[PDB]
Amino acid sequence: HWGYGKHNGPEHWHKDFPIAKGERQSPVDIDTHTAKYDPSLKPLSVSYDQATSLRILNNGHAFNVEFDDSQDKAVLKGGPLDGTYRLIQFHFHWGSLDGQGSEHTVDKKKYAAELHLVHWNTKYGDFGKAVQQPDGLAVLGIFLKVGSAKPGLQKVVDVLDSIKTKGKSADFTNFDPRGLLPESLDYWTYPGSLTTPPLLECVTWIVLKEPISVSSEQVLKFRKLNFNGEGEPEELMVDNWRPAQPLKNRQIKASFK
Ligand SMILES: CC#CCNS(=O)(=O)c1cc(S(N)(=O)=O)ccc1C(=O)O
Ligand SMILES: [Zn+2]
């Protein structure tokens, strides 16, 4: 099936998912000089005080921290968005070395990792219906650089030993995703897609300008995870990122000057 290897990686995905070569694919390089400041963009509204995390899952491609999205608890609004988007999960993409890992790039710079907080538009009633709509999802992307530790990430890091392999999950309640945010909510935004199969063109991307810092030890623990299931030959879960795709007929807008 699809993955991140030589034989099943991003360059192969178009055979099962022809939208891979579509008109609004993600990620993209963010050329900072070409992104236009848009004074009509609003501040982003991140309301995560009532977030209810439930579980952490190794899905064979990344690990997902899952939230209760059965009511408006943790929501994203404002910014480029119309209406209300509910947090369903977060996950990361990362590298085998600190010089690569992010999906978005900034003037061709790759960060060590990238956090994605996935939200769906409540006007469509459920996630599955939302992914069929061009404005169905809003994904908040946050770059990770290696430096000082991120205290709010350590609870995530410490549970990873319990979900080493594909299909393992663990209870993961009372995690506060506010502890993964940078100080500034300045952002770039553009219309795009999921970065994994099925690659659906249903996402408004919101990529924060300010990276968070995590420690070398924190990201090292991400790279001890496995793509494989229990008892199968060990394939370290590293380099689970799709490279930048053609921008085509899109404009990246900045919320800041
Ligand atoms: C049908 C369908 C779908 C997409 N699911 S997701 O939005 O949770 C998601 C989103 C993304 S990303 N990188 O596009 O935000 C990656 C991975 C996943 C996932 O299934 O775990
Ligand atoms: Zn992602």
CB of 25 sitting under 6 A from ligand 1: no
Per DSSP, which regions of the chain are E strands? 29-30, 36-37, 44-47, 53-58, 63-67, 75-78, 85-94, 105-106, 113-121, 137-146, 169-171, 187-192, 203-208, 212-214, 253-254
- Residue 228 has phi, psi (to 5 degrees) of -75, 160
**Beta-carbon neighbour count of residue 235 at 10 Å?**
16
Ligand 2 mean position to 62 CA, how many Å? 8
Question: Which CA distances in Å does 132 have to 117, 121, 129, 212?
Answer: 19, 11, 6, 32
Cβ neighbours for 168, distance < 8 A, ≥ 6 positions apart:
57, 58, 162, 230
Q: Name the structure determination technique.
A: X-ray
Rounded to the nearest 5 degrees, what angle is found at the Cα of 30, between the Cα atoms of 145 and 194? 85
CB of 139 sitting under 6 A from ligand 1: yes
Pairing of strands 137-146, 113-121: antiparallel
Separation of alpha carbons 121 and 135, rounded Å: 7
Helical spans, DSSP H, in 124-230:
127-130, 154-159, 216-222
Structure tokens at 31: 């050329």
Please choose, from the candidates 92, 87, 76, the residue with its C-alpha nearest in 3D space to the C-alpha of residue 52.
87
User: What's the CATH superfamily of 1-257?
Assistant: Alpha carbonic anhydrase (3.10.200.10)
Please choose, from the candidates 97, 91, 100, 190, the residue with its C-alpha nearest in 3D space to the C-alpha of residue 142.
91
DSSP secondary structure letter of residue 217: H
What resolution in angstroms does the PDB record give? 1.4
Catalytic residue status for 12: no
Q: Are 157 and 219 in contact (CB under 8 A)?
A: no
CB of 240 sitting under 6 A from ligand 1: no
